[PDB]
Amino acid sequence: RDLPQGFSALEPLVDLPIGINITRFQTLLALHGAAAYYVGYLQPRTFLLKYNENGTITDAVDCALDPLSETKCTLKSFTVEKGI
Amino acid sequence: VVLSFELLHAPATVCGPKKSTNLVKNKCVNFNFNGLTGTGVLTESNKKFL
Ligand SMILES: *[C@@H]1O[C@H](CO)[C@@H](O[C@@H]2O[C@H](CO)[C@@H](O[C@@H]3O[C@H](CO)[C@@H](O)[C@H](O)[C@@H]3O)[C@H](O)[C@H]2NC(C)=O)[C@H](O)[C@H]1NC(C)=O
């Protein structure tokens, strides 16, 4: 399958005090229809993080993806009504 | 035997147990949870935690 249109999160496990830059990375498999592991990048950006009563993430919008991105970025909301 | 504290720029979390004592309930006090302080009404609290 594909990376679905949906929601996710993560969780910290281990503090690794590396102290040095990292150049490359490589995976480990053992073999020998569409399944694949997708790798892009992470960028020095800023997002929006909406949270619930339980204390869990629900929605998210960038700051610099589009005009709507900075619109939610500064207006400090997810509804965000019309205007300039 | 030699004990060397290697305090490089690397984070400081390998530490010592300072004063872990009986929890002060319902007495207006500050606190020292590893670096954070504040005058707290420290008692059992009614919320879910993760
Ligand atoms: C958010 O916090 C609430 C607070 O407890 C969590 O609620 C718990 O949710 C589970 C299922 O999500 C409930 O289990 C259900 O119990 C009922 C009977 O109470 C049963 O009929 C169902 O079949 C199911 O087993 C659990 O009861 C409920 N807690 C309480 C005290 O009722 C919720 O899981 C938390 N959600 C997240 C995402 O952290």
From Swiss-Prot, chain B:
Binds to host ACE2. RBD also interacts with the N-linked glycan on 'Asn-90' of ACE2. Cleavage of S generates a polybasic C-terminal sequence on S1 that binds to host Neuropilin-1 (NRP1) and Neuropilin-2 (NRP2) receptors. Interacts with host integrin alpha-5/beta-1 (ITGA5:ITGB1) and with ACE2 in complex with integrin alpha-5/beta-1 (ITGA5:ITGB1). May interact via cytoplasmic c-terminus with M protein. May interact (via N-terminus) with host bilirubin and biliverdin, thereby preventing antibody binding to the SARS-CoV-2 spike NTD via an allosteric mechanism. Residues 9-31 are annotated as: Disordered. This is Spike protein S1. It comes from Severe acute respiratory syndrome coronavirus 2 (2019-nCoV). Changing residue 37 to K: In strain: Omicron/BA.1. Attaches the virion to the cell membrane by interacting with host receptor, initiating the infection. The major receptor is host ACE2. When S2/S2' has been cleaved, binding to the receptor triggers direct fusion at the cell membrane. When S2/S2' has not been cleaved, binding to the receptor results in internalization of the virus by endocytosis using host TFRC and GRM2 and leading to fusion of the virion membrane with the host endosomal membrane. Alternatively, may use NRP1/NRP2 and integrin as entry receptors.
